[PDB]
Design a protein around this ligand. Sequence first.
Ligand SMILES: Nc1ncnc2c1ncn2[C@@H]1O[C@H](COP(=O)(O)OP(=O)(O)O)[C@@H](O)[C@H]1O
Ligand SMILES: [Mg+2]
Ligand SMILES: [Zn+2]
Length: 682
Amino acid sequence: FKPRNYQLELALPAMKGKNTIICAPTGCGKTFVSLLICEHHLKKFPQGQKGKVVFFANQIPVYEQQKSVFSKYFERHGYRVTGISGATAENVPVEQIVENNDIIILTPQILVNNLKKGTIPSLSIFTLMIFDECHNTSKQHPYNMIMFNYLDQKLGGSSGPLPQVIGLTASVGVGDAKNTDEALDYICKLCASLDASVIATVKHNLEELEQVVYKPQKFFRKVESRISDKFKYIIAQLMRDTESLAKRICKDLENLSQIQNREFGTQKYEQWIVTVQKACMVFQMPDKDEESRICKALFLYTSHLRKYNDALIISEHARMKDALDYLKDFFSNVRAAGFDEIEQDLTQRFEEKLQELESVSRDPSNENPKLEDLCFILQEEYHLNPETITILFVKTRALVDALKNWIEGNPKLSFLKPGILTGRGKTNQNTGMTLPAQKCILDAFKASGDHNILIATSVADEGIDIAQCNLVILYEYVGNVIKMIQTRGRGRARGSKCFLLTSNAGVIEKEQINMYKEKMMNDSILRLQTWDEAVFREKILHIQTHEKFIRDSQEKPKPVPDKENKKLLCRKCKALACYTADVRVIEECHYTVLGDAFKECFVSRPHPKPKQFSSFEKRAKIFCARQNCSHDWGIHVKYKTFEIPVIKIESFVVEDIATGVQTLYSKWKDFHFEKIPFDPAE
RNA sequence: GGAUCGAUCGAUCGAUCGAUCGAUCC
Ligand SMILES: Nc1ncnc2c1ncn2[C@@H]1O[C@H](COP(=O)(O)OP(=O)(O)O)[C@@H](O)[C@H]1O
Ligand SMILES: [Mg+2]
Ligand SMILES: [Zn+2]
């Protein structure tokens, strides 16, 4: 590849010894700019010394891509390129990998962990430091942790040969800025976070960049919601019936939350039902036998209410048949699991109106107008250009399958081939798609491939390799200015559209203010690129000193841990699970329970996605061992040579033995008890 | 099992927490 003029212009300030925050839209070719910077940096050293340039890549796909690119480009002059990730540093010494190599493409988390425990005492071992998607420097990003270590070494007084920051990004972003002054302040703060005084943008060779980074045009498609909703009536009646049934066992159900006006099929109702569910978990009775039944019935009632609300939310954006299939799948999973009297009554009450629900869903006179407008614009764009590819975005993982089923089950648009792509999802749930599946989906999506449209989540916003599309569609998709720019930089074809379909003026207003914030960011960058380097260095030094003082001031010491024995009970059945005395912490993050009395309290099931994070190994998954509970208590791992269950506090109620009060914790950091470290003995 | 980011919503007094969803990493 020949270095273009604007690429050399962007790489010119970096080949001088000063840190740079070079930014360019998607498709400019910043990887080649970083390659040129790396090539120029590794030759400025005379005979006797060499460089240790490092390259940070957050995501594993882009990490492997950059590693392969650097290998194909640099294994010809005599440089040793390597790469560390989660499946590489299981037992290999990272220090020997860094010392015996010149170019490293490790992930920021591995570097953070090494700097933390025992490896790489200082960042002076490297000479160059490139950050892929450097805009991710934020409150607590690993990039920001590495930069915090860098700044603590710099402003500590004992600084040595510090490396050079060549962090590359596509959109600097403004954050929560409202005017140009706040945008400039945020840009200066981000510049001081990376310890750089130069922002390299394309100014002279702007005509060459526009010949390959052609930006699309945006079209707002605000439509009207459905007026005749016969599906919401039956689901609302079922929700009212379930709420009235739940009010029988809990008279003060309306006082458990401070939400006054709740509406079915919204997010406020979801918050209300979650608050109610959390309030009935700490419900205590001096019987230890009636409290469990009431708590279980309330848990089931709130779960059914949450499922009804989710079905209404799905039907608001998709067809009535999709929410009905979701409800049928939920009730079939309920039937396959434990079947008590409450669940039997709920299932029979649902089946009482399931026939009317099916009759309403089969009626084609109440089709979602949003889907009608989507079909219209899709068929229009595919009649104008048959060789078009769509990257239609959807904010919900449960809605991409609905959109795929709607596209497949529609005779009006048969030229489409769904190529849906969601992502890895939860690491302890059987949801999402794996990395090989994602690679196969992305490889089969080309101009001549077997997929001309993919319904993707926010996974296609950050660094990823997708074909050049021209039919970007945002179906109720809204974010920030950074995500807006990332989405717009996806349709960089020769003439593209960025349609935004929604049924709410709030999304249109948010897109307008995002465009305004992008203009503000551009103006702030243009203003900042005219200041002197000395005053900018002084300003970023002052900002770094202030941030370091703030970070060193908020060093909250560990409070006095409650050295009192308390019991952890199941969150669904309120059954005695274990005690806080037999709780051991492996590596200050994972909490296990030892003892033969606890092994008979849970049951093991095969894990869907086994993997090793640091030194464990997911062998199974633990659930409650009651009559019919099936409550997720944690997971089963193998630390060194023995199988141990590690649990999470987000599924256990903490009851004090002496006082008797119950409290709920979401993370183990909020649980301040006498945590004993794990001993390989016993 | 843990950590982090983004979006939306709720409580309290522009700020602090809480909830939902998506994504990333170990
Ligand atoms: N000088 C060049 N000549 C030919 N192709 C190039 C050149 N520079 C970049 N490209 C192509 O453009 C694509 C841009 O990818 P990359 O460099 O990662 O930037 P981005 O992250 O914006 O996509 C690369 O896949 C590369 O093949
Ligand atoms: Mg890049
Ligand atoms: Zn239980």
